[PDB]
Amino acid sequence: GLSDGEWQQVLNVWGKVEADIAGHGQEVLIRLFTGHPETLEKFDKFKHLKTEAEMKASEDLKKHGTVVLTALGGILKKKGHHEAELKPLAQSHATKHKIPIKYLEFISDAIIHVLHSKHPGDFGADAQGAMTKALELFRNDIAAKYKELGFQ
Numbered sequence: 415g416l417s418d419g420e421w422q423q424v425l426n427v428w429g430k431v432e433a434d435i436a437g438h439g440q441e442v443l444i445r446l447f448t449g450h451p452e453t454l455e456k457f458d459k460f461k462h463l464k465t466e467a468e469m470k471a472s473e474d475l476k477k478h479g480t481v482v483l484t485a486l487g488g489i490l491k492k493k494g495h496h497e498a499e500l501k502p503l504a505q506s507h508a509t510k511h512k513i514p515i516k517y518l519e520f521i522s523d524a525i526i527h528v529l530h531s532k533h534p535g536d537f538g539a540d541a542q543g544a545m546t547k548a549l550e551l552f553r554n555d556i557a558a559k560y561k562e563l564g565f566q
């Protein structure tokens with residue numbers, strides 16, 4: 415549950431992402447894959463990437479980063495009223511991709527890391543607080559759907 419002022423912060427931060435969605439999406443995925451190499455094994459189309467240089471050179475990885483962040487931005491712009499947008503993603507991630515909730519924690523922290531890395535000194539303590547709360551809400555509502563499905 416976020417206040418109006420917290421949502422305003424989230425959507426202000428998101429404007430930074432929307433100026434370069436592909437660059438942000440690329441770096442989020444590279445941070446996930448390099449920090450948590452077991453996550454790479456869930457992607458049949460990226461498992462061939464052995465080095466970070468290959469990851470950086472991959473245009474398909476940048477494309478997927480755009481898909482991921484476009485979906486997240488659509489959810490965030492709903493300010494919590496995201497049941498219709500979140501349900502298909504929870505279902506596909508539990509039943510088809512088999513993504514444990516832990517990996518959604520990993521990517522949430524990776525988003526925070528990338529924002530500080532690309533905007534040092536311009537991602538303030540209030541903005542970090544509000545973005546963190548929004549990613550927690552996203553993760554918590556997915557977790558509820560995971561429990562319904564019995565997925566661990």
Ligand code: HEM
Pocket residue numbers: 453454456457458459481482483485486502503506507511513517518521
């Ligand atoms: C911010 C969180 C995330 C968002 C919004 C997101 C969004 C999406 C979207 C929109 C798709 C394509 C449609 C679909 O299959 O439902 C996708 C595919 C996928 N997601 Fe996620 N995702 C997230 C996190 C993750 C994480 C943490 C993993 C794995 C560690 C992951 C693994 C996958 C895989 C394996 C695919 C299929 C890729 C393919 O082969 O083309 N996702 N995701």
